Amino acid sequence: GFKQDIATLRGDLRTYAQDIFLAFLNKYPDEKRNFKNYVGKSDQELKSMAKFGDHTEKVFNLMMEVADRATDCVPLASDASTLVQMKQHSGLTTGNFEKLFVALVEYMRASGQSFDSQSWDRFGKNLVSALSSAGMK
């Protein structure tokens, strides 16, 4: 289920992070402009860029901690707060997270592994919800 899925992603996290994030950037090409230097790059080009690799891993390093501290796919109120306050991230939006999670659920759906994709779908919704309530627009 959801807990075992955290262990599976964590076990090859750099490749899972890049591949789901690329699935996000390719489903919603308008997202690349939040990472402007990403625009007009192939998947293999992005994967060559230091900050792409490092940043996508840290996104996922963080989202796996929030998934691990969640109960029944509901994150800690405290976790959403910290995220809304995050230095250098004043401009994050909940609509951009819902897009990330759509991409993550389709990825898990299209894989031949027993991911609990309904659970991630729930988690995605519940994280947006907690982000909304913590004051992310």
Ligand X SMILES: Cc1cc(Br)ccc1O
CA nearest to 107, candidates 11, 22, 43: 22
Single-letter amino acid, residue 101: F
Find the binder of ligand X among 4, 15, 26, 34 (CB under 6 A). 34
Alpha helices (runs of H) in 12-42, residue ranges in sequence order: 13-27
Which residues are CB-contacts of 70 (< 8 A; sequence separation ≥ 6)? 2, 76, 123, 126
Kindly tell me which of 5 and 31 has the beta carbon lying closer to ligand X: 31
**Cα–Cα distance for residue pair 57/43, rounded to 1 Å:** 15
Residue written as token pair 């890049």: 18
Interaction of residue 92 with ligand X, rule CB under 6 A: yes
Site for ligand X in 105-124 (CB under 6 A): none
Is 18 annotated in a binding site? The answer is no
From 4-12, 73-81, 93-101, 114-122, give the range in contact with ligand X by CB under 6 A.
93-101
Is 126 annotated in a binding site? The answer is no
Partner whose binding site includes residue 93, from ligand X, ligand FDE, none (CB under 5 to 8 Å by kind): ligand X
Is 88 annotated in a binding site? The answer is yes
Interaction of residue 82 with ligand X, rule CB under 6 A: no
Which residues are CB-contacts of 47 (< 8 A; sequence separation ≥ 6)? 18, 22, 53
Interaction of residue 97 with ligand X, rule CB under 6 A: yes
State the residues that interact with ligand FDE by CB under 6 A: 34-35, 51, 55, 58-59, 62, 88-89, 92
Q: Which phi and psi angles does 86 have, rounded to 5°?
A: -25, 115
Q: Which residue ranges are tagged as binding site?
A: 36-37, 51, 55, 58, 88-89, 97
Contacting positions for ligand X (CB under 6 A): 34, 92-93, 96-97, 100
